[PDB]
Symmetry: none
Subunit: 247 residues, 6 copies
Amino acid sequence: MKNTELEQLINEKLNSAAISDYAPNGLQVEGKETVQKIVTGVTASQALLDEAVRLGADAVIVHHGYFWKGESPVIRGMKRNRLKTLLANDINLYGWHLPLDAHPELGNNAQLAALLGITVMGEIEPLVPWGELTMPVPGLELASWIEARLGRKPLWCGDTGPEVVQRVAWCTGGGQSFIDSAARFGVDAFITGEVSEQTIHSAREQGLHFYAAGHHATERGGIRALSEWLNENTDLDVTFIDIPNPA
Amino acid sequence: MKNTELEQLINEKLNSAAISDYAPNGLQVEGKETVQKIVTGVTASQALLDEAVRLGADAVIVHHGYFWKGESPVIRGMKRNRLKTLLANDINLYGWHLPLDAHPELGNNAQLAALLGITVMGEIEPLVPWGELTMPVPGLELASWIEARLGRKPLWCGDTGPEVVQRVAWCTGGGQSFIDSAARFGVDAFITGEVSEQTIHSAREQGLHFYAAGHHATERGGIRALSEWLNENTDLDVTFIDIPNPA
Amino acid sequence: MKNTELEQLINEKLNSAAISDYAPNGLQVEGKETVQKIVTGVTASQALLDEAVRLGADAVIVHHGYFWKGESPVIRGMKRNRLKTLLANDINLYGWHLPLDAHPELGNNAQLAALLGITVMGEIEPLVPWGELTMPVPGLELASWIEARLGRKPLWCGDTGPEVVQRVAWCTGGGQSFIDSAARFGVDAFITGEVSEQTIHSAREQGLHFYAAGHHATERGGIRALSEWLNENTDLDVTFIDIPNPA
Amino acid sequence: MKNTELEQLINEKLNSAAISDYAPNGLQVEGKETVQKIVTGVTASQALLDEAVRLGADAVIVHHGYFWKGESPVIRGMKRNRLKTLLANDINLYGWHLPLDAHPELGNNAQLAALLGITVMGEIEPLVPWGELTMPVPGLELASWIEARLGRKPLWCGDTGPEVVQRVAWCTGGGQSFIDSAARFGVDAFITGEVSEQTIHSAREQGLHFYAAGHHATERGGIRALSEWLNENTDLDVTFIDIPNPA
Amino acid sequence: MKNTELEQLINEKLNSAAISDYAPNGLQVEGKETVQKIVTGVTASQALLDEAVRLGADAVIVHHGYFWKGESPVIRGMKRNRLKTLLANDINLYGWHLPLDAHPELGNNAQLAALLGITVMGEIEPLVPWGELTMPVPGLELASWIEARLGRKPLWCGDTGPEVVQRVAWCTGGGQSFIDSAARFGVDAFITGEVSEQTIHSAREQGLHFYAAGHHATERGGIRALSEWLNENTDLDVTFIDIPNPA
Amino acid sequence: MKNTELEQLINEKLNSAAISDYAPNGLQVEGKETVQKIVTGVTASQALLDEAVRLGADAVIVHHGYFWKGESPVIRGMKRNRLKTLLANDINLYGWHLPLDAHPELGNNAQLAALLGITVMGEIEPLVPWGELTMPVPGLELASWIEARLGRKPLWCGDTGPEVVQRVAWCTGGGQSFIDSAARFGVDAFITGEVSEQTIHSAREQGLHFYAAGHHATERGGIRALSEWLNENTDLDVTFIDIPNPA
Ligand SMILES: [Mg+2]
Ligand SMILES: [Mg+2]
Ligand SMILES: [Mg+2]
Ligand SMILES: [Mg+2]
Ligand SMILES: [Mg+2]
Ligand SMILES: [Mg+2]
Ligand SMILES: [Mg+2]
Ligand SMILES: [Mg+2]
Ligand SMILES: [Mg+2]
Ligand SMILES: [Mg+2]
Ligand SMILES: [Mg+2]
């Protein structure tokens, strides 16, 4: 496949062109024209890049690439190491940020719901679906469940959360700021990846169970999902590598 | 003391005028004129408020108040309950954000340094001081040190940091975004309150020990220090109340 | 350093040659001659092996390697996957079994003692040290201490143990069979890693507190200290990786 | 019945003499010639023995008796108390080990298959049957079924096992070393009583669900079934006593 | 000692005369005047009486004797066999009920707290002391702790109890009716011997852990302690005998 | 149906006013007048009440209601929660105690006998029927059969009962005090729900097999049968709900 054909293929599968974002979606750094072996992971860290070079990948696809709004375009320190590892080896880098969080099937938000056992039912706002657990359980049990399914112990705050959690809303990664919107919609628990100082007061004062189950942990689902989608719908050789990040 | 007097007293001790901020610094909600019993804390949470009410406080002073830039001005949910507890009881709410982060004597950044045994020596950027531990220790020992001093286990990332940590930079609260700037300046360790997904790659790729010691935990120092200053320089009856927040 | 050189350095520090074993101690699978980066772990599993590859290790060092007496020589299944990862990448695999259980300073046994707060005072038999807890406590209290220090709830049988445990014998890993020898010597508790059906009768009928604290959990001690020893005594770059194992 | 007659009766029903074992099968300790009341249990522990004395038994029959190969012959400590209790009271001790594991009808392996709802279909190796659950289920439901049926929560490692378990191999007691042969055979799960450190690597790297269901827990079926068969086929009064053992 | 002397001596030690009871406390069935050898136990069942005869005792002392309020006076069945064994052999039968449950030193309630490691701190109601575990633990562990100290697995209902148990109330024997009084006083656990249908709802709806640890299991303590007290304070020969009872 | 009419219908089918009881039989807490949907169960616990609320029930009928003789009338803790749920939602509570144990067709005693396979042949006293198993069996087998039909392992004491059980007497619930009455009449076994310390002695000394099969497990039959009887003879929608209770 040509690198530009692959950009167009996933752009169309994820209705990318239609979504405003904090960074460029699609081909971020151009490499050789022909793409046959693909390495993907949550973030284009130096460590993922090093696996793509070790594996002889032609392209790398991630949910967090470079060139974020507000960033300095200067190329030094980390940025110089990353771009040189890509450019010298002719590796194509693609990033799909909000389109891969939102897709109904392959997105981070839909995959978390499948992994945690939540029946999606509607959407509170663009990146915040809500639904119900198919097996309603107490706040403590839900924490252990999230810990067993993502393999990471979440920050659980449920000082004033309901006795049993049924209705839930969530947003993967750094979606702590949607907690009020979810509490205002009416839920039993709100789940996200990161947490901030104010997030705790929102859970306490609004009567809900809150979980920060990890930015990286809650965001392996979509890129892994898109990687499967590529292996089943093309002849590409796509390998998804989960490189652990505590955050 | 009069409410407007107290405002001008603390505004001048913290050179507040000369500091751009994300929210109004000073008297945020006007209550009775005469102030004598003051309750303070890290954030004007409903819980700190109900303590002010139980203690028959005339004013509450915090580091995190209301009216953050970009916030919806409508008064509903939590803002209604909070503002009603203050206006109905004639309690003055005062808040100081960045000026209480930076003051060289009473600020959260100077009080963390005192607490962890760091000799301040310069400033990399306005909210980010640098200095040297008085007793250099290996990354593991500094993590245990931070946890004993703050009473909270920090997230520590030292995959690629020096054998012994001597030079340190820091920013209390959510200053994770200052990590690359500390890296370019040159430090063995960077400490702040919260953590983001990109912060972990900044720690590994630039070879430094990183600690996320908690937003609330790294921010009890300054408003506690200011409360002492008030009890020591005025006849005001000030009680600092620490309400645990895991974030 | 030269792979054969690193083999002689550790053999001599651990007095390996003078100790008969169930498997070869030293370089078990040869790789590239020049070793500078090493990854270590309790067991040369496929998981550790994959982390060694990913981090560009030239050698892997473990407490449990391959070629155990009685095992079939044929290379198939897990053996084939494991040997290939090592051989295709020129990675040296070394292992030290009994020699790393027993070394007075760096061994598994002496390191468990320091972690648990036991003053070593002697040995009942070659892999069975004896000593006393610096702070004597009841059986139940000791169970929570071992759980807190090792990060794993131990199986505790104390149906007939003394009211306070002071004198203790122990043997990391699969040493449940040394319990009768410990009882005849005279101790209040026996601690090991695994448990067997007969172990519980031994505990009960001989009046001691028995603890099965984890084969893996009790054997991260030696390999991690041996890794600290190499970083402090050579210029090799050694990283210990703990890959959790329930047993 | 005459003590030696009962020996011969059970030796024949179980085809004992044709199975090489690690300890003597049959009458291990002679007692009064005339047998009428018999107490049975998993292991000839001091507790079962004291029970047989209290009930006035003339014999005891167990799965685990004495005299294992390589054990010291000397009679001291536990052996002295156990042998004294039997000899002073003229109580006959019988033990059948591998024969009582294997009998197609009354054996521990067949009894466990019946308890867990597994249709026996063949034999992988002598002590390791295989079959299919009459009701296939995911690995978590099976952990719960085993825990419900055995009365003990098993250790369940299934991080890489199939979504639904149907084909199963098992060996009661200490059969962990048989897991690799079951993998080669091709099964979705392997169940045994104990666990060892290498067993967890075998489950993960070969993709199967593994369960250490308890050594004593998985071995009550056989001696209990034998006890039932004697009450149905002789005029003997045989009682089975389950004396709890968590291993 | 004269039988009437021994009665007077235990009455005063236990402050018996000043306690209303459901049966006569003291000498219930008179026998020979001179008492030298005494056998004791929880209940004057036929099995106990029979040991008294075999052992040639002059007297038997229990916690549960005869003549309970409400009982038929007619002497037939069990009562005839029991009374014949005592009268024909001239054996004295003494029984102390509530006095032996309540004595602060020798009573069933004080002996259970010492067996279980509880520091007695006061009394909720006449037969229900309250106290704190010197080693607080979760409800599951306390269950295992009760099992091991008593030698019998208790029924543990802890669906809604606290995460850690510290304050506890108890009443040996059939004291399940006191669970609501304990819940009203404020406790993390209530322990007794028997259980009733309603006892479970009290536990669940009042948020405490409940344990039915055995009527007989929890009442060996008092009569055994009075037995050691007689042996230490007189020249009598008293043997306490535990005859197992499941309830 | 009108609430006072339903009361009447069941009072007459169970000949209730004729039976004197420990609590009022019939409508115990009046609710809305029109009843159409009804939830039933063994005891009016908070848990059944909350189900009745979830399900929109107009009435709840149980075997155990409130207002037992001797109980305090005050409404607090548990009674307040329960009564508030009923009264605030206008749910009628009806309860029938002894008339629901005794009815020849629908009662707990007759329904247990149909379940267990016993032909009822007459009665010893009011709540204690007697009969014979259609298939006589040893007491061990009877234990296993009771466990299979009721779903709970019973306590079986058969130390001294007949080799085979044929004639049986039984009382569901707390009927242990009837065991001496069954023995004098002449039976092989006596079956009830709960057990008490003295019941074990009655069993041993009177030579009968005794089974405590569970107060809750033996009392589902009646209210379940009454609920079917209401669905078949009225237009009411009745749902019997089993809320497990181990006692
Ligand atoms: Mg995202
Ligand atoms: Mg801040
Ligand atoms: Mg700040
Ligand atoms: Mg080992
Ligand atoms: Mg070892
Ligand atoms: Mg075995
Ligand atoms: Mg076996
Ligand atoms: Mg009693
Ligand atoms: Mg009592
Ligand atoms: Mg009843
Ligand atoms: Mg009843």
